[PDB]
Design a protein around this nucleic acid. Structure first.
Lengths: 259, 147, 185
RNA sequence: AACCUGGUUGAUCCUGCCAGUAGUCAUAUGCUUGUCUUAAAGAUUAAGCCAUGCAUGUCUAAGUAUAAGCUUUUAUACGGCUAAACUGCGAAUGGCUCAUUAAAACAGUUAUAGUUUAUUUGAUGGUCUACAUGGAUAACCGUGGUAAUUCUAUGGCUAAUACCUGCGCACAGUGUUUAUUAGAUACAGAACCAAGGUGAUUCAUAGUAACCGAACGGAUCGCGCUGCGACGGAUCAUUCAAGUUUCUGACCUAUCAGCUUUCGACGGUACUGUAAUGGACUACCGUGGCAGUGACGGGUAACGGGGAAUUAGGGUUCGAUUCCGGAGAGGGAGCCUGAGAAACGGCUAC
RNA sequence: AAUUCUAGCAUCCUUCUGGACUUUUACUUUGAGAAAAUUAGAGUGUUUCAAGCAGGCUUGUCGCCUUGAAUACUCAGCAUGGAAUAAUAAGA
RNA sequence: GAAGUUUUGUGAACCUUAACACUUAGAGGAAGGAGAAGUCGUAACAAGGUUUCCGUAGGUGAACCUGCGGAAGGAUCAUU
């Protein structure tokens, strides 16, 4: 009541962080570009994915060196919400991490090449006219690129340059274009787009087809266009967003563990 | 027509336009009626004539009285499941609802579809979209139709 | 204070509504400034957000747009003439929205001489062009000008803005309110 | 494990209850008790009352240093380091409890074209003595009052990212307030004269005519013709939110059947008020609204849900209590400051 | 060849290049979206076990298993394929 | 821009009356069950010595009795 809540609790955290039940009563709380449940804070990358830090203390000792950057910019706050399709860049080690969705429905820092780690994609939420009658995009990231093409519509991605501010490569939202899912049940799945239903009132949905010919649906808010009909602007994680079945995921896992 | 103490005037039309009439197109797959365009009535709260969006829900039901001015009340009927006995149960809710004077001769026991809008008074949230003439015999509140 | 909420007062059934909560600041109202004629005074009320909302208390003057001619002049007020809601507000001269008011009309008469040169009671070319471009003036407005007054509807909310603005009455609105002035007489 | 034995008769077969039996990751209590791992615990009745101590404070190269402080390096404005004090930000989170409360709250499901939003993230913007404007305030020094406290007066100095003013092109910006034009779209054209965006708008935005000062357009700070970032503040998104809001859903009770209204009950017009929508409130006007599918009223040893116990299936009972809402700080009521409180480890009154 | 689903032909629409019409729902099917904890449950010798979400290989050192922590479950509401059943509508 | 002050609204608290709710005293009256054994009958169970019972009415120490109309749960499934 009475104002914004400064604590978040463990358990009442998101499940896709995979913070454990014991070993803490509270969990780190991420406001930044991204939402609370559609992001992951910079602490649980460093300690609970990348395994650089042990403790919450040690993440302060890393981040206040000014070694961590995101989007070619130094972020000093340890609880910064670093979300979908943000680049992370550490100068020592000289390795870069683009955050994608894993096929199971988790965040994972996908390691990438140095030339690839310049650019990143931003799907545009809407397009809107600012003052002096100038046009302007706005993104899922909460950037606002201005003077686009007239070409560029809602619900489609743009390759940003990052080294400079400006856009470079557009993409369109149509049938036969590659598209990852960012939320809901089918998260972490990439497939070409077959068809979308309108439903003139609320909630457009899209059916789309995995590269092993599995068909599945999501709302348009969740869908995020990568690239053209086959091929893709970005590098993909392990499995490339197929999501193999429950008995298959059993068989591959226990076949691994026997060595 | 000027019934009231204040001058009833349609916003949308400027004082420069004093012949011209404003009419909105409400959308959502609902056609604008002809008597909205042709006639000379005002209504602030009409979907087709004045400032009110329709947005969110749409509700069908049976009209049970049309006594109060520029407003009706619409009996919704529905079955309620009772999982122990594995068996249904007839309930109702009287939604009170605005209607505009484009719809001439809205009789008791007519069918009427009605979209949600901002709260216009305490009881009414919904506004009319479209009506249909049908007879009903004896009492209207007895008449159970599910839609 | 003044509670705007629906937790007090009856249900549609005619039943008392249970209330288990104390009044909330976001369910606020405030005492109404029945603002009037006089020399100007205005009070900044600090509202929710931090945002300021300026309460009128006495207003002499206002910006009033003639619609047809497409001009607006700053003008002094004389008196409140009619109100739709309440006759007590006319009795005290209380400015509110939709309230019909008297106006000097010497700003418009000076403009109408200067712009057109038909009047009431190198350029010349510019005046002629303006006349061709836009001056017949209704028969009732011709009679109305002779007194040194006009009639006009207050369009702004003085309580929120801290400002009396309006527009001049013309055509059907003007013919309408001339009935209900004459009817009480 | 989908389970059954004893008791009415001189005896039998029934209906039928009483008693037995088992579980509780439910309390209490008796007797007994060697070991290690995990661990509920002033909820039930008295949301009865409280001694003492503690639970909210906070400083970077970067707001203000003349401690009549320290420290060895010795600096004609300012060597650093810093008590104290002013300014900024926080104190509205967390924690505790379950007395209220029965279409209320809450749950899932919409809407916000009906709105406010510190901060974060990204945008934007020359248009109105400019080598620099003003005078007071602590701590400090001198000095008192009172029995007594986080009581404080008089006198003397001095600061600012405190407080208040305030020129400016490279008539004239942005914002506020009203009026008002454009904001096109199922087909091709011919002759004559004087192109954003929604399912959807009065939306975005541009243009025209004026309005006010009551708001922005940097009199700020550190490292180093020239880079980096600290702070301030406006509008627009964004994020953390919050406020309302659509639909559907609850235990017992009819030895509760008719409730609601001139003092808002249901609706209409036009104000007012609010962050905005509304009988939310005020004028006039109409006579409505709910109910036998349970209105209105009463009871609860009732906060709601996620859940818990219970060995076929269907169910029955519990949920003060780890998470998410809600409400409260002895009882009621009022209010300041702020982005946010009708706050109680803030204030005023009974 | 059984068991699914589907095009034709016995006189079977079309306005276009997937949606519009077939009275309307219920019903059933698949799909969306819906916090975790708890509950069932995949994997794993916490010495067993209640648990927990960890671990496991190995004289190699930018360690590897491009490591795991799956998945189900959550009336009313939104969407959709369908020939019965049952309401309901009607009667150029 | 202080003290003080005018009129409004928000409105604690206290009091009068009334109603509703819930505990609680009461001379006397009059129920039910328990004792564990008393006094007076004998009503029912057999045709229980006047068959039993129902509804209603009146009367009497008490069970009960009688009037009118029913029932077999009767002591008769039965005879121009």
């Amino acid at each position: 009541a009475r104002g914004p809540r400064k604590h978040l609790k463990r358990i009442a955290a998101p499940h896709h962080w995979m913070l454990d039940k014991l070993t803490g009563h509270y969990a780190p709380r991420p406001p930044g570009p991204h939402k609370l449940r559609e992001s992951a804070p910079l602490v649980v990358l460093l300690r609970n994915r990348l395994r650089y830090a042990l403790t919450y203390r040690e993440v302060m000792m890393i981040v206040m060196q000014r070694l961590i950057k995101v989007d070619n910019k130094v972020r000093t706050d340890q609880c910064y919400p670093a979300g979908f399709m943000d680049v992370i860049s550490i100068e020592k080690t000289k390795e870069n991490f683009r955050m994608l969705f894993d096929t199971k429905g988790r965040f994972v820092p996908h390691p990438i090449r140095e030339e690839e780690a310049s650019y990143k994609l931003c799907r545009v939420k809407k397009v809107v006219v600012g003052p002096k009658g100038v046009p302007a995009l706005i993104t899922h990231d909460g950037r606002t690129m201005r003077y686009p093409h007239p070409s560029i519509k809602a619900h489609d991605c743009i390759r940003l340059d990052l080294n400079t501010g400006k856009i470079v490569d557009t993409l369109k939202f149509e049938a036969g274009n590659m598209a990852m899912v960012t939320g809901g049940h089918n998260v972490g799945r990439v497939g070409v787009i077959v068809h979308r239903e309108r439903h003139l009132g609320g909630f457009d949905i899209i059916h789309l087809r995995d590269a092993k010919n599995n068909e599945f649906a999501t709302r348009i808010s969740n869908v995020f266009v990568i690239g053209k009909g086959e091929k893709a602007w970005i590098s993909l994680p392990k499995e490339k967003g197929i999501r193999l079945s429950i008995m298959e995921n059993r068989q591959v896992l226990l076949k691994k563990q026997q060595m | 027509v000027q019934t009231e103490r204040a001058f009833q005037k349609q916003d949308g039309v400027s004082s420069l336009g004093r012949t011209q009439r404003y009419w909105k197109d409400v959308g959502l797959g609902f056609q604008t009626p002809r008597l909205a365009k042709e006639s000379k009535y005002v209504d602030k709260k009409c979907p087709f004539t004045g400032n009110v969006s329709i947005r969110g829900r749409v509700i069908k039901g049976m009209v049970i009285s049309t006594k109060m001015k520029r407003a009706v009340v619409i009996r919704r009927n529905y079955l309620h499941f009772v999982p122990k006995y594995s068996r249904f149960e007839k309930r109702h809710k009287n939604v009170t609802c605005h209607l505009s004077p484009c719809f001439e001769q809205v009789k008791e026991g007519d069918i009427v579809t009605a979209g949600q809008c901002r709260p216009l008074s305490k009881t009414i949230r919904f506004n009319v979209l479209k009506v249909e003439k049908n007879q009903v015999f004896g009492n209207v509140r007895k008449q159970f139709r599910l839609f | 204070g003044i509670s705007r909420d629906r937790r007090h007062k009856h249900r549609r059934t005619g039943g008392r509504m249970p209330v288990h909560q104390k009044k909330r600041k976001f369910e606020l109202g405030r005492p109404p400034a029945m603002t009037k004629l006089g020399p100007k005074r205005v009070r900044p009320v600090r509202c929710r957000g931090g945002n300021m909302k300026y309460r009128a208390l006495r207003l002499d003057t206002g910006n009033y747009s003639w619609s047809s001619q497409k001009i607006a002049k700053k003008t002094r007020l004389l008196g409140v003439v009619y109100n739709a809601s309440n006759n007590e507000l006319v009795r005290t001269n209380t400015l509110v929205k939709n309230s019909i008011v008297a106006i000097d009309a010497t700003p418009f008469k000076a403009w109408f001489r200067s712009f057109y040169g038909l009047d009431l009671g190198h350029t010349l070319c510019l005046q002629n062009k303006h006349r061709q471009q836009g001056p017949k003036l209704d028969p009732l407005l011709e009679e109305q000008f002779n007194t040194g007054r006009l009639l006009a509807c207050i369009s702004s909310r003085p309580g929120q803005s801290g400002r009396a603005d309006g527009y001049i009455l013309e055509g059907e609105e003007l013919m309408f309110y001339k009935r209900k002035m004459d009817k009480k007489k």
